[PDB]
Amino acid sequence: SHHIRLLQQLDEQRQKDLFCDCHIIVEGQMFKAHRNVLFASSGYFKMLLSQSCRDMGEPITATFDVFSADTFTAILDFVYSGKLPLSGQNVIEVMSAASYLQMTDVIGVCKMFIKSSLDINE
Amino acid sequence: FSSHHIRLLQQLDEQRQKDLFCDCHIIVEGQMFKAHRNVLFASSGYFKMLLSQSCRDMGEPITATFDVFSADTFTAILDFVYSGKLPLSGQNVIEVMSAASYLQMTDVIGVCKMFIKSSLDINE
């Protein structure tokens, strides 16, 4: 109960640029988020923010040209909700983005959704 | 139930105990508590007001103070914030209710008033 509420509240903050010390540029589009949540949710961010984790200064600005802004949206939406919206169109790019960002849970979800479909060679 | 929510709070509780991303210091009866202002904002109405104005100012860490409750009382309150588990008893139930009220934590207040129904109080 308290766990669900806290995450519902934090998702609201990032959507209002509240306490957002981390900017993320993916294909020009910018995503605002919390440096302590990304650190707890992604191995990539656990490494990128590791050194500058007690430097309260300007907000830290990450960049990505390795996945699409739509792909990263589903990734970031999952971080603050625990719900990943999958489909044939997104399942692959989400798995890639989750791997690059070191989000093992999202990868496992994809390989389960992938096992729930059929792909073959031409 | 939700492992994603449980893990995140287990992870955030560890961060504050290692002064990681701690932009809020709290001095209660000399003892200092390090925590995240975005979590306190989400968990307490008092902090939702104290930090309201300075909510997009990424600068020096904000340092709050309290002489209205004990450091032990604030620990149980703060430990609940990062765990969701509040251990109540006759010794703390009143001071926790006071601290929860002052901090505007309606859920903690209701929990105390429920444990209060689990004891007996009468006039002397």
From Swiss-Prot, chain B:
Protein's cellular compartments: Nucleus
Record-annotated BTB domain positions: 22-90
General function of this protein: May be involved in transcriptional regulation.
Name this polypeptide is given: Zinc finger and BTB domain-containing protein 8A.1-A
Native source species: Xenopus laevis
Full-protein residues shown: 3 to 126 of 470
